[PDB]
Design a protein around this ligand. Structure first.
Ligand code: MG
Lengths: 92, 95, 91
RNA sequence: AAUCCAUUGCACGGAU
RNA sequence: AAUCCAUUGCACGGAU
RNA sequence: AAUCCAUUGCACGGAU
């Protein structure tokens, strides 16, 4: 989805990277754009190669996506959209 | 030839998912690109040489420039948009 | 590196393109983002398929990276990062 | 309309 | 853990 | 010069 959101959806991630390293790496890269509330990574069948970065502010999310769109990350260009719906911690 | 990087009122988008029909492509493109400025037109055609392609015409060059810097590589119907500036002025702009 | 720098690092370049045409073609793409101080290309084994574009202003390098990330050059998407270290002409 | 073949194309095609 | 196979997936797998 | 093999490499090769 193209509708600005607090959360960015990243896919095409290198699946060899384990959750802890991926979370640390995504936080170091994306922290620059503003305060990150959380990064949700899962390694199960439907969730690998994927991350949700939840920014406190939409303006940080918009800036992260526009700057990091296509950035080569562990040999794969990041594909970044806005999450299709609000992440739970944002919804409350 | 190289990607065209000389700012222009019009951005040229290729590598569009060709399964998307004209009406929906224009409607989706408007929804995405209207956040960068006022859009005068969006030219889509589904002929052989025109498929996979759109011209989005902004009233001001500054909007084209923001649109290109922002939406480059956006995953749009599972294919990253490829954006340049239009080689030459659109007719709407020329008059 | 993901940190803005005066210098952009490009790889996944079509190794068939020769130095002069690669350098001329990179100026024609990237010069439109602001003044380029230098474009460094070598075709030696460790250096081929790569270029460093040194901009005068960091805003120019940032606009160039964001705007041309993944854009096909001689049938290959350009992979653009910021240089890990300042180019010598900058330092 | 749909499925398939082909098309990465800078403007103001073919098959069932 | 690792290795191989499969998976491009919008959330709060299989084999040694 | 051309072509083949190898190389995805963060700087200031082999081969006909
Ligand atoms: Mg078809």
């Amino acid at each position: 989805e193209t509708r600005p959101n607090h959360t960015i959806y990243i896919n095409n991630l290198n699946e060899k990277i384990k959750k802890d390293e991926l979370k640390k790496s995504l936080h170091a890269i994306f922290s620059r754009f503003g305060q990150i509330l959380d990064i949700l990574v899962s390694r199960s069948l439907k969730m690998r190669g994927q991350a949700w970065v939840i920014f406190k502010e939409v303006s940080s999310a918009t800036n992260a996506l526009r700057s990091m769109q296509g950035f080569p990350f562990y040999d794969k260009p990041m594909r970044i959209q806005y999450a299709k719906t609000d992440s739970d911690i944002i919804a409350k």
